[model samples]
Target: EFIRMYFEPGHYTVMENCGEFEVRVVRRGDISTYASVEYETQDGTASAGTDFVGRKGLLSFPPGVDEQRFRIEVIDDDVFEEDECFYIRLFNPSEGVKLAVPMIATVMILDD
Candidate 1:
């Protein structure tokens, strides 16, 4: 069986002080076996360690499991600025799982 993994809501937008946003890795197709995946966060207009914590990690999905979530903490700052953006890209899928379209997810932060 062929399994594909991708992000939900390929793009997200949120206001500052909204706490955090979750990017979910979802499996498309029958999950008959375990799947392993990896991803990393990159800066666009928003930066890691400043706008959000940089994350580079792995995720696993057991049989019958279809989804996993990654939380991005929005660093609330006192500076006034325009909207910013960041990205998350999934790669190196294992156990016959393929990376699907929209491997990169964009997060837009609206300055509050």
Candidate 2:
């Protein structure tokens, strides 16, 4: 028996004024087993606190929960720009969970 965790699709895009970006985390292999993963937001082309609110926390899946989700706040600033990007990566998986491929998800904040 094995537990695997990864970000589904691996990429996300949302409007700068959207306010929030909700992303999905997928749990594969053993859905009935309890699992957890530590998540954190890192800068890509986007700056933390300016373009978006950085988030870091644990995502827990209690038995039978295969899909989990979290949100990051997107800051719509006064200055106008083309678009910005950021990253949300997964790490420090639980004992029974194995970190899978596509662990990092790219987030693009589009401006209009």
Candidate 3:
């Protein structure tokens, strides 16, 4: 069976005052062995390294394990504006693993 990897919720939102949010990366289907994949954060309306942490790295799923998590740091400023957003995209799947479900996860930061 093909191994599938995906981000739970695909879309998420946090208030500016919250400071940060955690994104869950998960795998499913025949997860009897080790599987791996990579992901990177892309700026949408949110600026990388400013509005949020710019992240890019690999994720591995150990035998019988199914999920992992990463964090997005939100900068809390005194200004108000529309909700800002960004994306986390999965790529470079390891052997036997396929990118599935919502490959790109959207994050929204609500203005305070």
Candidate 4:
């Protein structure tokens, strides 16, 4: 079973052991301001998969790096609109030295 974690609203979260693995959620583009966050699991082993996963809001990572960080941001502009929410699941492999994590981030357009 995978345990899930989520972000409230207007807050920056970080992982303690982020050796080579790091997760950052930030604003994307100039006009649109489409929210996007990325989880980068460096050369390490994860119970899930992939090196980097592009998510909308929430980010998750397995216990690999000595330290890690989790953060979230919301920016509403004139040219474009922005709003988002998400959750993550961190898993570790039982065998092998690899990591695979799946993150889910959702966004909603407020106003223009």
Output the TM-score of candidate 2: 0.94
Worst 10 residues of 3 by lDDT: 71-80
Question: Per-residue lDDT for 4-82 in model 1, tens only?
Answer: 9899878999888888888888998868788889999999999998888898999988889999987888889999989
**Candidate 4, residue 111: lDDT:** 35
Q: List per-prediction Cα lDDT, in the order shown.
A: 0.89, 0.89, 0.87, 0.29
Which segments of candidate 2 are over 4 A away from where they belong?
none
Question: lDDT per residue, candidate 3, 1-112, as tens digits?
Answer: 3888889979998888787788899998877899888999999999887678798988878899999887778888787779888899999988888888799998998888
Clashing pairs in 2: none
Residue-level lDDT for 77 in candidate 3: 79
Cα RMSD (angstroms) for every candidate in the order listed:
1.2, 1.2, 1.2, 16.2
RMSD of 1: 1.2
Would you estimate the TM-scores of all the predictions? Answer: 0.94, 0.94, 0.93, 0.22
lDDT of 2 by residue, 1-112 (tens): 2988899868999988889878899998887778899999999899898899988999989998997899889998777887778999999998878888899999988986
Candidate 1 TM-score, C-alpha based: 0.94
Error of 1 at 88 (Å): 0.2
